[PDB]
């Protein structure tokens, strides 16, 4: 089936970006530092290193791939 | 106030009211244009700014050798707003940090030292949006720079206001005009441009446009980091609605700007902390 609401309800386990980069754990120190000043929806569960869309990004789910600004990538999902 | 003076510094309460204009109940020569729409096909080009017309204008310079790098804006007596790509862009091996830069505030002329007018300041720290998307489309192209020491306001140096939800809803609408300033003229150049509908902006480029951007200008046949401002007809204050990101002159030009209100939460969190 197709993923709705641009993945804001996604519970999957996809942990790699569209360009083949492995996702970092949301609980990792570098990830938390990048997330610190952003505005996330507490409803979205940042589990393991699975792709999620906590900020409501129009492009869809994504994940961090490193620890510097801009080090994130979107994940290949099928949206409705 | 939206910000805490303890961390934000002074200036919010009196933001957006220029000492040489609003404070003297005077209007500059072209702000009337922000309310009128010409359809005579007149060429839209940058013209020389009036003295003290954009007191929040900030120039970002490479410390040594001295070289103008980008524009920026003063939002308080110690915080400056600019575009993230002006400081960080990995594809070009660009990664400017606080000690590699300096800012010049209150300037009118780009080429000479303005004694008893301009102020030069060093930076204490730079903050780049964690999800500034340099790998793809420059989404969230925004950065904050904290001054080493507070700058003193004057007739030539004064902070601009940042919009609230209500202000953004009322002013940032297709058709309304905004003003961009930047720097072969020797003085600060000004140009007023109309905001263009998202679908039309989209249609002009292959780059993915986001809700964190907006565009203005005219269809084709820079002052990156600088401000795109609008004057409120409701409180008479100037607000910075955008930051020149990519894409503001007269062949035919669509400029793209960082949607400041969309990123205000981030600004608040950063300042509320350092």
Curated annotation (Swiss-Prot), chain A:
Its domain of life reads Eukaryota
According to the entry, every stretch annotated as the Kringle domain falls at 2-80
> In this UniProt entry, which cysteines form S-S bonds?
2-80, 23-63, 51-75
- What is the protein's name according to its record? Activation peptide fragment 2
Task: State the organism named in the record.
Answer: Homo sapiens (Human)
Q: What is the lineage of its organism?
A: Eukaryota, Metazoa, Chordata, Craniata, Vertebrata
UniProtKB/Swiss-Prot annotation, chain B:
Natural source organism: Homo sapiens (Human)
Please name the gene that encodes this protein.
F2
All residue ranges annotated as the Peptidase S1 domain in the record? 43-272
**Positions annotated as active site in the UniProt record:** 85, 141, 224
What is the designated name of this protein?
A: Thrombin heavy chain
Which part of the entire sequence is included in the shown chain? 322 to 620 of 622
- Going by the entry's taxonomy, the superkingdom of the source organism is recorded as Eukaryota
Give residue numbers for the site Cleavage.
Answer: 42-43
Residues bearing glycans: 95
**Disulfide bond annotation, renumbered to this chain:** 15-161, 70-86, 201-215
**Segments of this protein annotated with the region High affinity receptor-binding region which is also known as the TP508 peptide:** 216-229
Coiled-coil residues: none
């Amino acid at each position: 089936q197709c993923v709705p609401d641009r993945g804001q309800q996604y519970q999957g386990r996809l942990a790699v970006t569209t360009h083949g980069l492995p996702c970092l754990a949301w609980a990792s120190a570098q990830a938390k530092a990048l997330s610190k000043h952003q505005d996330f929806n507490s409803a979205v569960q940042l589990v393991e290193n699975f792709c999620r869309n906590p900020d409501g990004d129009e492009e869809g789910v994504w994940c961090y791939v490193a620890g510097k600004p801009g080090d994130f990538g979107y994940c290949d999902l099928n949206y409705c | 106030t939206f910000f805490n003076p303890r961390t934000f510094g002074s200036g919010e309460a009196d933001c957006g009211l220029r000492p040489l204009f609003e404070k003297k109940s005077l209007e500059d020569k072209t702000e009337r244009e922000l309310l009128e729409s010409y359809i005579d096909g007149r060429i839209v080009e940058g013209s020389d700014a009036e003295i003290g017309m954009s007191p929040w204008q900030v120039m970002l310079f490479r410390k040594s050798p001295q070289e103008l790098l980008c524009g920026a804006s003063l939002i308080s007596d110690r915080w400056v707003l600019t575009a993230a790509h002006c400081l960080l862009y990995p594809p070009w091996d660009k990664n400017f940090t606080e000690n590699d830069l300096l800012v010049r505030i209150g300037k009118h002329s780009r080429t000479r030292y303005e004694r008893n007018i301009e102020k030069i300041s060093m930076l204490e720290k730079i903050y780049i949006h964690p999800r500034y998307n340099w790998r793809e489309n420059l989404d969230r192209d925004i950065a904050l720079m904290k001054l080493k020491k507070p700058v003193a306001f004057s007739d030539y140096i004064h902070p601009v206001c940042l919009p609230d939800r209500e202000t953004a809803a009322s002013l940032l609408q297709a058709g309304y005009k905004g003003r961009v300033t930047g720097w072969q003229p020797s003085v600060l150049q000004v140009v007023n441009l109309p905001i263009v509908e998202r679908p039309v902006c989209k249609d002009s480029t292959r780059i993915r446009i986001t809700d964190n951007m907006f565009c203005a200008g005219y269809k084709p046949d820079g002052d990156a980091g600088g401000p795109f401002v609008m004057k409120s007809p409701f409180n008479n204050r100037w607000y910075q609605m955008g930051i020149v990101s990519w894409g503001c002159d007269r062949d035919g030009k669509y400029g793209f700007y960082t949607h400041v209100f969309r990123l205000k939460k981030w600004i608040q969190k950063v300042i509320d902390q350092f």
